[PDB]
Ligand SMILES: OC[C@H]1O[C@@](CO)(O[C@H]2O[C@H](CO)[C@@H](O)[C@H](O)[C@H]2O)[C@@H](O)[C@@H]1O
């Protein structure tokens with residue numbers, strides 16, 4: 001395979017490494033490295049801890065971006081400082097359980113997998129060692145996404161280009177933290193110690209936490225998403241294990257691929273869309289109003305009470321044609 | 334803004350205020366009033382009670398109908414007889430958290446919000462005061478829907494008009510009523526008294542009841558939906574917090590916008606469709622057979638055991654070509 | 667009704683009785699027989715038992731295949747060896763609650779129902795006796811599917827024929843097996859004895875098991891699905907009561923009707939699709955790589971821990987262009 005090689009410097013979510021939308025490049029071998037990290041992390045503002053397992057130290061794993069017909073060559077590294085075997089399954093790839101059957105590595109090993117990007121869209125990647133370890137590694141945080149863009153960039157299905165000014169990747173994580181007898185979340189010394197209680201809870205199908213970017217409030221305050229009025233923002237949303245229903249409070253999905261695959265035309269003008277567990281989808285919105293937006297899953301219990309709220313802070317001029325407070329709050333006459 | 338004003342007299346669900354589909358009117362300011370009512374109601378045939386919070390006294394709130402490019406001017410009233418602050422978020426609107434950031438009113442106040450109907454479809458509206466109150470007010474009943482019709486009426490995406498003979502609005506409500514130690518549903522003196530137990534249950538994500546129009550059996554008996562053979566009926570379905578999968582038992586969705594947005598062509602000939610939590614969708618069906626139909630969510634446990642069944646009673650002539658009982662029940666030979 | 671009659675010999679899932687895709691036949695009366703069987707079965711590799719109720723002895727019931735405009739004439743038989751009344755509701759049919767209102771039969775009876783296949787697609791059929799028996803009979807196993815093909819066969823919505831080399835029917839079943847005090851699954855002497863505990867669990871909406879073809883591991887080992895590289899396989903998936911999110915691990919859905927209705931064009935290039943509870947959908951894939959695939963619902967907890975995994979064993983030549991292990995596992999440098 002005698003194609004040009006291109007290295008990518010991955011960046012932590014919700015940001016996305018620099019890339020072209022439309023490109024004049026032909027196929028390349030695009031090189032990525034992912035280093036697995038098992039680590040205890042804090043997942044809420046109460047200080048609850050969690051035995052996480054991650055690609056590149058983040059939940060979600062970073063977004064990888066290539067174009068249709070590229071070859072994606074991933075060096076997956078499992079340092080000796082980890083305790084368990086791991087692998088990678090790319091839903092964008094064809095064969096060998098998405099790559100999982102070719103990438104199982106013990107602590108102290110690395111492996112190099114290449115796959116041809118024959119399907120466009122956004123796709124989940126995740127660890128999948130075998131058997132009951134599959135769900136456990138995924139809900140412990142071992143999932144991310146890859147975006148395979150058409151070489152001509154995105155289109156509306158009507159002949160028009162859809163160019164985004166910026167893209168964010170929102171990875172949603174269902175987490176299963178057990179409680180003790182008096183009702184407090186438990187803490188564990190190792191993922192292995194957490195396994196028995198965690199699996200018992202997993203099988204009951206109700207998460208304790210549903211978070212974006214690994215933690216309650218991760219995408220708020222200093223780390224709010226941003227935009228300006230007039231900017232077209234692409235929001236990639238993934239969920240490797242469980243359904244979600246994204247919604248931009250005060251906005252819309254102007255163009256939405258809820259099944260996430262660019263061979264299909266987008267839907268237009270959505271209020272709320274649906275990410276099937278085990279998939280990524282994408283929504284584009286051109287901001288029209290400044291101020292705070294919340295980006296949620298629209299199970300509002302999940303959003304407000306279990307962790308699944310991000311914010312956008314948007315700069316620009318208020319549009320009184322689109323909305324106005326005709327009369328401020330006043331005593332009823 | 335010097336456009337003509339038009340008042341609407343809202344009507345309680347499942348009925349819909351009179352409106353045009355295709356219209357020769359240009360944009361107007363369409364005036365609506367919603368008066369919040371907190372009230373204890375009965376939600377099942379056992380007499381279980383529920384601390385409801387409502388727009389205009391109903392669950393769901395009434396369906397508002399306008400056309401693309403209208404301005405929707407809502408007077409939201411929170412009488413002093415209520416206990417809590419409330420607001421309104423229109424998923425059809427652009428800016429200020431759907432209007433929620435411009436409509437927070439204490440008991441004794443009213444506010445007037447106007448928004449431009451730039452997106453077509455059916456959309457959820459709901460209360461959203463802030464924080465954990467968001468889910469609580471919504472699952473207490475504070476949600477309804479708005480329909481923004483194209484000025485040319487509905488179409489099939491193939492150049493043909495789709496005209497409905499009547500429309501019904503089915504609002505589905507997930508309810509969380511706690512149980513005491515011996516397993517009976519609890520009753521509370523106020524919404525505030527219900528809050529702690531109700532939130533604890535909410536976070537476990539399993540409703541005690543799933544109802545249409547506020548109560549088990551609301552859309553049955555005297556209050557069954559009706560049609561005649563040959564009539565095209567539009568069924569708007571909303572769910573502000575939780576997924577649903579509508580199905581007309583003995584019928585179909587001839588034309589379905591399950592994401593609910595009229596810029597997209599309908600799907601055809603569905604058995605069951607999917608309303609994402611936080612959205613409204615719509616289905617049209619031309620009745621072909623008389624008799625009783627059930628309209629359900631097709632989690633049949635929810636439908637038959639938790640409350641989520643409506644009936645249609647349909648008049649007309651039986652069509653033996655479409656279905657016939659060739660041989661009535663008889664002893665096996 | 668003076669049309670030619672054609673008998674079908676049904677075959678147990680996941681296989682499908684022989685049929686034409688495109689056909690030069692005109693409408694016929696296609697005759698099917700379904701004999702209900704109530705039976706205690708084993709559903710997992712631990713030996714857990716289950717009070718099943720079935721059409722033709724299988725979970726799911728067998729796939730029936732006809733063409734648009736055929737008349738489907740079903741003899742439904744409820745032998746005296748059963749204990750309960752049963753009926754059948756075809757989501758493909760128009761009128762009388764899908765046929766349920768014309769097919770209620772006591773043990774010792776049979777009934778003959780005919781319906782005209784006016785809607786194309788894959789559709790659920792299920793028992794629906796009335797009231798709380800509806801969900802109970804369905805989650806006890808009394809559901810299957812029917813496929814109504816266009817007379818010209820399937821198409822891509824772009825003028826091209828889509829011909830499958832083989833079809834499999836995967837019926838997914840949510841099961842509710844109660845546990846005793848010490849946490850073991852309970853066994854019952856009759857469906858009636860199982861009812862009280864089973865309904866109590868049903869209403870909590872969390873299954874104990876989620877299986878394909880009636881049992882954990884049913885579609886693995888000797889009974890793995892099969893294909894060859896180059897074969898186009900249609901996978902019909904149904905779920906009569908509860909959502910699912912199918913995914914072919916190492917493959918894709920090349921053409922997917924997730925709402926299952928052939929009047930709509932398929933989506934292309936999906937990773938994971940969505941079967942709404944109360945529906946059947948279908949996905950076509952042309953295999954490109956040999957080896958083992960898993961076909962799952964992509965709630966991976968359900969897939970790996972509750973029973974919902976099938977395998978494909980695929981023969982043919984490995985394609986190193988599409989995927990290659992560039993470097994086998996090795997010590998990190
Ligand atoms: O106080 C003993 C009494 O408490 C229970 C819980 O209801 O068990 C608690 O105490 C045990 C002995 O200290 C612990 O092992 C156990 O984990 C804790 O729940 C009863 O089982 C016991 O009779």
Ligand SMILES: OC[C@H]1O[C@@](CO)(O[C@H]2O[C@H](CO)[C@@H](O)[C@H](O)[C@H]2O)[C@@H](O)[C@@H]1O
Pocket residue numbers: 514
């Ligand atoms: O009978 C007392 C015994 O019952 C429990 C429940 O198992 O508590 C009940 O009685 C308490 C005292 O009357 C109530 O406060 C409580 O709400 C009720 O559940 C035990 O905790 C107690 O030992």
Ligand SMILES: OC[C@H]1O[C@@](CO)(O[C@H]2O[C@H](CO)[C@@H](O)[C@H](O)[C@H]2O)[C@@H](O)[C@@H]1O
Pocket residue numbers: 847
């Ligand atoms: O040992 C009696 C004590 O056990 C409990 C369960 O905590 O009930 C068990 O024993 C009863 C009498 O044998 C059984 O009927 C019951 O089904 C079983 O759970 C207590 O209720 C009882 O005090």
Ligand SMILES: [Cu+2]
Pocket residue numbers: 053085086087127128129137142
């Ligand atoms: Cu892993």
Ligand SMILES: [Cu+2]
Pocket residue numbers: 089091124126278913915964
């Ligand atoms: Cu996967």
Ligand SMILES: [Cu+2]
Pocket residue numbers: 386418419420460461462470475
């Ligand atoms: Cu409120």
Ligand SMILES: [Cu+2]
Pocket residue numbers: 247249298422424457459611
């Ligand atoms: Cu909302």
Ligand SMILES: [Cu+2]
Pocket residue numbers: 719751752753793794795803808
């Ligand atoms: Cu039955």
Ligand SMILES: [Cu+2]
Pocket residue numbers: 580582631755757790792944
């Ligand atoms: Cu049904």
